[PDB]
Amino acid sequence: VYTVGEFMTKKEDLHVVKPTTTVDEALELLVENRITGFPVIDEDWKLVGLVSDYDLLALDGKLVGDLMTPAPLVVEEKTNLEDAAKILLETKYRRLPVVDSDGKLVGIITRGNVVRAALQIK
Amino acid sequence: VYTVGEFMTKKEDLHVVKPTTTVDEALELLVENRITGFPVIDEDWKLVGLVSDYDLLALDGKLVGDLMTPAPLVVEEKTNLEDAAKILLETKYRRLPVVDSDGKLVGIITRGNVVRAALQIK
């Protein structure tokens, strides 16, 4: 079987922030890195939240920790890719953080990554 | 005043498709270019539609033209940036195509671009 860990955006090529990151640091990070959000880690690289441009710009002196959406839906590396694919493909979710046994964030799987996986079946 | 044309993603750095583009070509383009959609142009570089991953993967032998969302909300280059900013910041829209007098697509303004603009005010 395929796993999320094989197709995920690995830890090396990630963009993360901490709850100590300022809204301006995060806005900067988004602008440079052409992303619309990041996973949010504590000092132990544990996953404590997710944050997006909508959250940053209060849409509808403050820090990511203030505006982040904490405790999100999560997958594992050994997680069968097809389950991840179901979620990605049947919900508003375009990303899912991948964490390990110790709750430590080790990647992210996007609907893109799933698409790429589908395509590289050849 | 500021205009959209000053801060938009210009025509050079664009990614477009045509209605003749196949779903697989578009899926490829998305995977390489890390985008979640494109503007859709005819041969005259006129804007005829918009298309996204959700449309591509029929979510909820075919071509973009079949699945594209045509005739979307549009801005101009001389369009005062702040109006664009209002739309971007008060709606589900993260992108807006920029076209000229002849209806020809000459760029796109994203909420990102607006953010970058806000930041480079310094």
Swiss-Prot record, chains A, B:
Biological processes per GO annotation: cell redox homeostasis
Compartments, record wording: Plastid, Chloroplast
Name of the protein described by the UniProt record: CBS domain-containing protein CBSX1, chloroplastic
Membrane-spanning ranges: none
Keywords linked to the UniProt accession: Acetylation, CBS domain, Chloroplast, Plastid, Repeat, Transit peptide
Cellular compartments per GO CC: chloroplast
CBS domain boundaries: 8-60, 68-122
Keyword Nucleus appears in the UniProt entry: no
